[PDB]
DNA sequence: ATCGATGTATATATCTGACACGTGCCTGGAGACTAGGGAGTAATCCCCTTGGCGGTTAAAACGCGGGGGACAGCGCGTACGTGCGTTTAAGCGGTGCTAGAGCTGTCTAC
DNA sequence: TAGACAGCTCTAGCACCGCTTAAACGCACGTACGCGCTGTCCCCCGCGTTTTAACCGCCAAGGGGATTACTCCCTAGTCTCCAGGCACGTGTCAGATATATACATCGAT
């Protein structure tokens, strides 16, 4: 049947998630992730939902900043596929690695 | 004790965050690399928020704890209190 | 007859509330009279600029109600507000619709 | 007390002054308080260190004038200086 | 006229240096650098404690606010050792008059 | 009247507790400052000073100098990972940089 | 004027070698002159603003330290 | 034939001395002139303390050496050795300077 | 080209819940008088920043060989993109509960 | 006098079930893109030569930064009051959802 070319629906996803607003991470696994992270520092924590969505928004924004820096450095590396070393270089340049 | 929710951050979520991040094509170890970076960032922010909760002698992490944790690192987040 | 300080300054933001926040904010032991007027003017101007560009973005998005997507568009489109808010995350704002030119098809 | 401190009415009437046909969303409204609040502590803290360095004990329009010229970008700082001096002049003329 | 007094942490830094290294000297630019470091770290911790007291509507900065500032700003082992040192100093000063 | 004994000597500290308390009070940090706050803060400052001074003395032994120069201070800051994280945005005057050459610039055989 | 070109190409090479750069292209000298120029514009503008708040006709190292730590990079041993 | 080192040996060796050394790598008179020329645009008849220009020189040198380190890191990341200004632009863009 | 799929933009109707407006309230702001000290101004001094000259030597600039590295071209293969079937749990809704955030009162250490 | 404590409220966070389903997952399949390889050629390094100005020292001066003294006026301090500002109430309207329809863009041909 009909099959799309490699990269064009990736660009469609880029457009459709850049025009969107909503969160790209499933809320229940991320909340469970926050609980299993925070259980280390103290046991028997409670979390307001507003705290959960705040943590999720901060995580998603920091991640997409990492992806845009990674894509910039990978295109700088004359590539379109991003390498993990691109992420490592981006975090080293940003001052957090 | 909640365990192994890092795999709850699934492959479609990471590729969606790459698409919003402008990434067109993604390698294989990128998923676990972003998972480890998410570990680093979440441990730091959640540790600061737990310390903020500890000074207030509370047992519930409030969103104001989260915004003050983000504020100390300079990655301020808007819409949950000033 | 009590008449407010904001009208005397010709401003909209509360001069009295600003002076109260200054005096309890522990920045100095004394606060001048015209200083909170200046604070209110600066805050009102920044608010007016961001609301104007948010309304422009809402009209571009054919909306008569400002949503945070218009706010992210207004912050990241204007260069001065983007430089002032470079270390700033807006929740439910998304990102700018930018695509790298190499990733475009040939 | 149950009452809260916010700049909601002020930002809403500034919106009505600028565009008197546009509504505002509640999450966007809290974002407006977020804006106003933290630029308040950055400008106020800049005024505090400015008063501290010159061994001053009061915050006048000069300290925040320097603070605005520092923190704000050039056209924003210049406009803020001009209209803040205008507001101060209008306040002092009306006493 | 006579020059006014200019405060420095120089003698205390020299005493700590002789405590950690009884034979090692110090240069003037080096004591200036350590004086600046002490002043900046003092400013950071005191400002963090001031903001912490503002967050929890407290009007008195005590050892708890400074301890939470240490727990926040310093890294984990540095903060842990500083909490231990400050705790023993506070307890032995409380035992004293 | 009893003998005047300093707060720092009572706290077992070399950093001046009274001077730290004075700087806290006129630093406009709070309208009240507790008794344990300047003692605790002076202890933390003395601990950090002791760590950096000990590492700088170790660097001065490594450079065979008895006087610590800003190069020793820079080496002591950057070799320790936690002190480097504490002073990441800190520049140290003429302490230079770490001697580091990445491997791909090294000659091959 | 010519004072930006007073930052000589050997000086730029020396500083790149301190930065661990093995090989330097010819446009790097002008690019680094521009980057140094804009960084100096920002820091000197902030320091002059601090000076003018102090009603002084000279620029002190204290104002330099204040401007630098406003910019986010703080310098030790020159005040503060 | 005169002894001539291969391209890259001298570069590595003076990398080594200027990683050992701590002195300023800019002549102080041209940088003084550049600082005062830049400060001319903000206020006329400005004077400068020697310590102030010293602090500006050391801070600028440290900032650009960190920039050079990130530039070489991004150049080697592109499977290269020579740095082009695109490397500097990428470093400042990821660092949020552009 | 070219058509055909194919998603998007555009126009219209139903709905709803979110906000735009109204009410009451109260407390926060404003008005009035008070002290006082802080900041402003004038006088003072000196230093240090500026300016100049001299020389002189180190560095900067310049020429040039050359090599080696930047980069274009090509091959390749494989890993990632794209599609399909399955299923998994994210999600929504309702129910249960209680830990605990929140507030008020007391007072005494501070 | 504030904050540590006690005590009370009652909010909300957690926990749970169950159905739904869209999201995630497993997997086929081919090709585009990473990467290796090769050639090229240029252009940057290395080094000698020439140039130059950076540097140090030394002096002169003046100006302005710091200091001192005086004052007044501006800001805290205090109080009464009253109106601005702020939960609650309300309702209606902007936006979401749904449907038809045009329209450009991709892709096989």
Curated annotation (Swiss-Prot), chain B:
One of its GO terms (biological process) is nucleosome assembly. The modification N6-acetyllysine is found at residues 11, 39, 59, 71. The modification N6-(2-hydroxyisobutyryl)lysine is found at residues 11, 24, 39, 57, 59, 71. The modification N6-succinyllysine is found at residues 11, 57, 71. There is a cross-link at residue 71 (Glycyl lysine isopeptide (Lys-Gly) (interchain with G-Cter in ubiquitin)). The modification Phosphoserine is found at residue 27. The modification N6-lactoyllysine is found at residues 11, 57, 71. Keywords: Acetylation, Chromosome, Citrullination, DNA-binding, Hydroxylation, Isopeptide bond, Methylation, Nucleosome core, Nucleus, Phosphoprotein, Ubl conjugation. The modification N6-butyryllysine is found at residues 11, 24, 57, 59, 71. The modification Phosphotyrosine is found at residues 31, 68. It is found in: Nucleus; Chromosome. There is a cross-link at residue 11 (Glycyl lysine isopeptide (Lys-Gly) (interchain with G-Cter in UFM1)). Demethylation is performed by JMJD6. The keyword Ubl conjugation applies. GO terms for molecular function: DNA binding; protein heterodimerization activity; structural constituent of chromatin. GO terms for cellular component: nucleosome; nucleus. The modification N6-propionyllysine is found at residues 11, 24, 57, 59, 71. The modification N6-glutaryllysine is found at residues 11, 39, 57, 59, 71. Core component of nucleosome. Nucleosomes wrap and compact DNA into chromatin, limiting DNA accessibility to the cellular machineries which require DNA as a template. Histones thereby play a central role in transcription regulation, DNA repair, DNA replication and chromosomal stability. DNA accessibility is regulated via a complex set of post-translational modifications of histones, also called histone code, and nucleosome remodeling. The nucleosome is a histone octamer containing two molecules each of H2A, H2B, H3 and H4 assembled in one H3-H4 heterotetramer and two H2A-H2B heterodimers. The octamer wraps approximately 147 bp of DNA. Belongs to the histone H4 family. This is Histone H4. It comes from Xenopus laevis (African clawed frog). The chain holds residues 22 to 103 of 103 of the full protein.
From Swiss-Prot, chain D:
It is found in: Nucleus; Chromosome. Monoubiquitination of Lys-90 by BRE1 gives a specific tag for epigenetic transcriptional activation and is also prerequisite for histone H3 'Lys-4' and 'Lys-79' methylation. GlcNAcylation at Ser-82 promotes monoubiquitination of Lys-90. It fluctuates in response to extracellular glucose, and associates with transcribed genes. GO terms for cellular component: nucleosome; nucleus. Keywords: Acetylation, Chromosome, DNA-binding, Glycoprotein, Isopeptide bond, Nucleosome core, Nucleus, Phosphoprotein, Ubl conjugation. Glycans are attached at residue 82. The keyword Ubl conjugation applies. Coiled coil: none annotated. There is a cross-link at residue 90 (Glycyl lysine isopeptide (Lys-Gly) (interchain with G-Cter in ubiquitin)). One of its GO terms (molecular function) is protein heterodimerization activity. The nucleosome is a histone octamer containing two molecules each of H2A, H2B, H3 and H4 assembled in one H3-H4 heterotetramer and two H2A-H2B heterodimers. The octamer wraps approximately 147 bp of DNA. Core component of nucleosome. Nucleosomes wrap and compact DNA into chromatin, limiting DNA accessibility to the cellular machineries which require DNA as a template. Histones thereby play a central role in transcription regulation, DNA repair, DNA replication and chromosomal stability. DNA accessibility is regulated via a complex set of post-translational modifications of histones, also called histone code, and nucleosome remodeling. Belongs to the histone H2B family. This is Histone H2B 1.1.
From Swiss-Prot, chain G:
The keyword Cell membrane does not apply. The modification N6-succinyllysine is found at residues 9, 55, 69. The modification Phosphoserine is found at residue 25. There is a cross-link at residue 9 (Glycyl lysine isopeptide (Lys-Gly) (interchain with G-Cter in UFM1)). Keywords: Acetylation, Chromosome, Citrullination, DNA-binding, Hydroxylation, Isopeptide bond, Methylation, Nucleosome core, Nucleus, Phosphoprotein, Ubl conjugation. One of its GO terms (molecular function) is DNA binding. The modification N6-lactoyllysine is found at residues 9, 55, 69. It comes from the Eukaryota. It is found in: Nucleus; Chromosome. The keyword RNA-binding does not apply. One of its GO terms (cellular component) is nucleosome. Demethylation is performed by JMJD6. One of its GO terms (biological process) is nucleosome assembly. The modification Phosphotyrosine is found at residues 29, 66. The nucleosome is a histone octamer containing two molecules each of H2A, H2B, H3 and H4 assembled in one H3-H4 heterotetramer and two H2A-H2B heterodimers. The octamer wraps approximately 147 bp of DNA. Belongs to the histone H4 family. This is Histone H4. The chain holds residues 24 to 103 of 103 of the full protein.
Curated annotation (Swiss-Prot), chain H:
The modification N6-glutaryllysine is found at residues 20, 43, 79, 86. The modification N6-succinyllysine is found at residues 20, 43, 86. It is found in: Nucleus; Chromosome. The modification N6-acetyllysine is found at residues 20, 43, 79, 86. The modification N6,N6-dimethyllysine is found at residue 43. The modification Phosphothreonine is found at residues 44, 71. The modification N6-(2-hydroxyisobutyryl)lysine is found at residues 20, 28, 43, 86. The modification N6-lactoyllysine is found at residues 20, 43. The modification N6-crotonyllysine is found at residue 20. Acetylation is generally linked to gene activation. Acetylation at Lys-86 (H3K122ac) by EP300/p300 plays a central role in chromatin structure: localizes at the surface of the histone octamer and stimulates transcription, possibly by promoting nucleosome instability. The modification Phosphoserine is found at residues 21, 50. GO terms for molecular function: DNA binding; protein heterodimerization activity; structural constituent of chromatin. One of its GO terms (cellular component) is nucleoplasm. A lipid is attached at residue 74 (S-palmitoyl cysteine). The modification Phosphotyrosine is found at residue 5. The modification N6-methyllysine is found at residues 1, 20, 28, 43, 86. The keyword Transcription regulation does not apply. Core component of nucleosome. Nucleosomes wrap and compact DNA into chromatin, limiting DNA accessibility to the cellular machineries which require DNA as a template. Histones thereby play a central role in transcription regulation, DNA repair, DNA replication and chromosomal stability. DNA accessibility is regulated via a complex set of post-translational modifications of histones, also called histone code, and nucleosome remodeling. The nucleosome is a histone octamer containing two molecules each of H2A, H2B, H3 and H4 assembled in one H3-H4 heterotetramer and two H2A-H2B heterodimers. The octamer wraps approximately 147 bp of DNA. This is Histone H3.2. The chain holds residues 38 to 135 of 136 of the full protein.
